[PDB]
Amino acid sequence: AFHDVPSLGQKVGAGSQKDVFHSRQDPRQCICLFRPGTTGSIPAEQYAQKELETTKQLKNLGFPVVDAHALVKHQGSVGVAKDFIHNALDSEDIVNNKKSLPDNLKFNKNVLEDCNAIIRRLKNLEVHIEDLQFLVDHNGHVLINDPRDVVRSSPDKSISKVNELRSHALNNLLD
Numbered sequence: 001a002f003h004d005v006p007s008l009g010q011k012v013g014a015g016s017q018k019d020v021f022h023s024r025q026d027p028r029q030c031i032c033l034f035r036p037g038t039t040g041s042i043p044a045e046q047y048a049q050k051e052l053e054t055t056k057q058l059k060n061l062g063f064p065v066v067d068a069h070a071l072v073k074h075q076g077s078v079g080v081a082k083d084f085i086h087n088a089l090d091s092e093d094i095v096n097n098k099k100s101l102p103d104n105l106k107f108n109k110n111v112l113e114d115c116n117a118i119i120r121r122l123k124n125l126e127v128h129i130e131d132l133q134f135l136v137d138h139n140g141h142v143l144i145n146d147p148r149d150v151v152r153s154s155p156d157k158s159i160s161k162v163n164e165l166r167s168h169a170l171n172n173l174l175d
């Protein structure tokens with residue numbers, strides 16, 4: 001299931017568990033690899049599979065997602081090949097006030113409308129997405145990234161997650 005990626009492209013980011021690289025085989029994609037030791041007692045393979053599967057479940061449910069295409073490995077590290085979102089902003093940086101959305105009007109309008117649509121679907125379906133977070137693309141579109149699970153349950157916590165991010169766009173559009 002895990003397909004070898006002999007050569008990695010330029011590094012574009014790093015989080016609490018994953019290093020992310022340009023895919024050399026496809027410029028539209030990136031290679032997202034779990035760094036050794038970050039997943040503790042759960043095999044990283046199981047995290048990668050759950051990331052891919054949950055992404056496909058959410059796509060099937062109509063959510064906007066960073067699409068994921070395959071399980072990959074490189075030098076014994078495992079992960080997921082995904083769409084590359086150029087100049088992406090991490091939602092956690094925005095809600096943490098570590099970074100700021102651009103002032104652009106159309107940009108914040110896309111953030112607002114996309115957050116509305118995500119909340120709308122969460123509320124209607126009544127599903128909960130574990131570790132819900134997003135990438136915001138260069139036009140302001142909001143894409144679910146690194147979802148760990150989705151289950152039918154109270155959507156209130158997930159909605160609060162989206163509302164966190166939307167509030168920054170909402171505040172910009174009022175000013």
Ligand SMILES: Nc1ncnc2c1ncn2[C@@H]1O[C@H](COP(=O)(O)OP(=O)(O)NP(=O)(O)O)[C@@H](O)[C@H]1O
Pocket residue numbers: 012013014015016017018019020030032066082083084085086088090092133135145146
């Ligand atoms: N599909 C992508 N396209 C573009 N940049 C990406 C993509 N996935 C991740 N990145 C960048 O790489 C960084 C690390 O990815 P991320 O998936 O958030 O790491 P993580 O360790 O799995 N979880 P986290 O601790 O929340 O960052 C992000 O903050 C982005 O800057």
